[PDB]
Amino acid sequence: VRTITVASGKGGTGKTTITANLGVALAQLGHDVTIVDADITMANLELILGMEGLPVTLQNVLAGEARIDEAIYVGPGGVKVVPAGVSLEGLRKANPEKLEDVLTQIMESTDILLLDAPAGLERSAVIAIAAAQELLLVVNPEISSITDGLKTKIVAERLGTKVLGVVVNRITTLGIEMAKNEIEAILEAKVIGLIPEDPEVRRAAAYGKPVVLRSPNSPAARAIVELANYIA
């Protein structure tokens, strides 16, 4: 019923980390959550969720080789995952109608649908943004990252996707306050999450257990469930 796309400007902000743990934190709060991994890249949801290879993807479901139920897997903490298999652009050109109904079937199966959009502003990304009602923008406290994020914000507004708020990932807790105001001023939007730089989210990735479960008290984890609370 609630569809949110997580997107960013450049390619290395750490958004997939936020999407995965956000979903796990959301599921831990009792919400029926589903993440559709639209980022056909290495170091994605499968790695961070510590999940084993996923056989059936949407590409299979769109080709009529399988039922959507077969492309929905259960991950850590109860979060569900749906692999796109092929870029959204591809699925969309293959059959626009089918793609929409399948997305509908998915929305039916949950309360919250998170779309891990591909890195930047490619066709597949804008499609992901337009497909959601809300956009969760992820940026780093670096200028380049913040301006690239502004373009993403703009695209969402051009399309009619409402900005849920912006998440600043990997900030040093020292200046935060001034930084937050500064960032909110640059891309005129509200930051609803400040995830401090944390070695633990890197080790979480390397070993396959989301920080939210691996290290519940690390500052990154607490910041993320904090964000899931705001969102839910």
Side-chain angles (χ1 to χ4, degrees):
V1 321
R2 186 124 91 98
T3 305
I4 303 169
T5 288
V6 179
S8 67
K10 287 193 67 182
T13 61
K15 59 181 281 291
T16 293
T17 290
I18 280 67
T19 304
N21 283 281
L22 182 61
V24 176
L26 248 26
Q28 288 293 71
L29 291 171
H31 292 285
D32 186 0
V33 180
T34 297
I35 300 171
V36 17
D37 177 44
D39 198 332
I40 291 57
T41 185
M42 265 57 105
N44 58 290
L45 284 182
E46 294 187 60
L47 180 80
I48 295 168
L49 253 38
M51 301 202 286
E52 187 166 51
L54 305 173
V56 185
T57 71
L58 287 182
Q59 182 199 194
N60 301 137
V61 168
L62 228 64
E65 311 170 306
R67 298 178 298 85
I68 190 173
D69 314 65
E70 306 176 67
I72 298 176
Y73 307 91
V74 179
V79 183
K80 282 176 285 179
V81 178
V82 173
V86 167
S87 76
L88 260 30
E89 193 193 317
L91 297 169
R92 194 231 212 184
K93 64 161 181 53
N95 187 184
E97 173 182 46
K98 197 67 174 177
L99 180 57
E100 178 175 1
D101 294 330
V102 172
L103 258 310
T104 291
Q105 290 192 301
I106 292 167
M107 280 176 239
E108 278 180 45
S109 75
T110 33
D111 308 312
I112 303 182
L113 173 62
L114 299 182
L115 269 166
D116 188 40
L121 240 40
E122 65 187 72
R123 203 85 177 298
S124 290
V126 326
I127 293 179
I129 293 171
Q133 311 145 185
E134 299 167 284
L135 173 69
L136 182 60
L137 185 62
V138 173
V139 305
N140 295 136
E142 172 190 301
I143 314 179
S144 163
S145 182
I146 294 176
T147 62
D148 268 40
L150 180 59
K151 300 180 182 177
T152 295
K153 182 230 190 187
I154 290 295
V155 163
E157 284 184 57
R158 277 169 68 106
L159 276 37
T161 306
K162 281 300 182 178
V163 179
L164 176 48
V166 39
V167 175
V168 188
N169 192 38
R170 300 164 182 167
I171 37 72
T172 62
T173 62
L174 184 45
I176 48 176
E177 302 95 354
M178 301 167 272
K180 178 172 179 173
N181 295 147
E182 197 175 63
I183 296 177
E184 293 186 312
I186 301 187
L187 60 231
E188 41 185 297
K190 195 152 68 66
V191 317
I192 56 179
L194 298 157
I195 325 301
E197 184 80 293
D198 191 0
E200 278 302 61
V201 358
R202 206 234 314 141
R203 302 190 183 82
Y207 300 118
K209 190 166 182 177
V211 264
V212 170
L213 302 167
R214 179 164 177 291
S215 301
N217 196 271
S218 80
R222 289 181 285 118
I224 294 167
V225 336
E226 196 171 71
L227 167 69
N229 278 148
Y230 175 89
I231 292 173

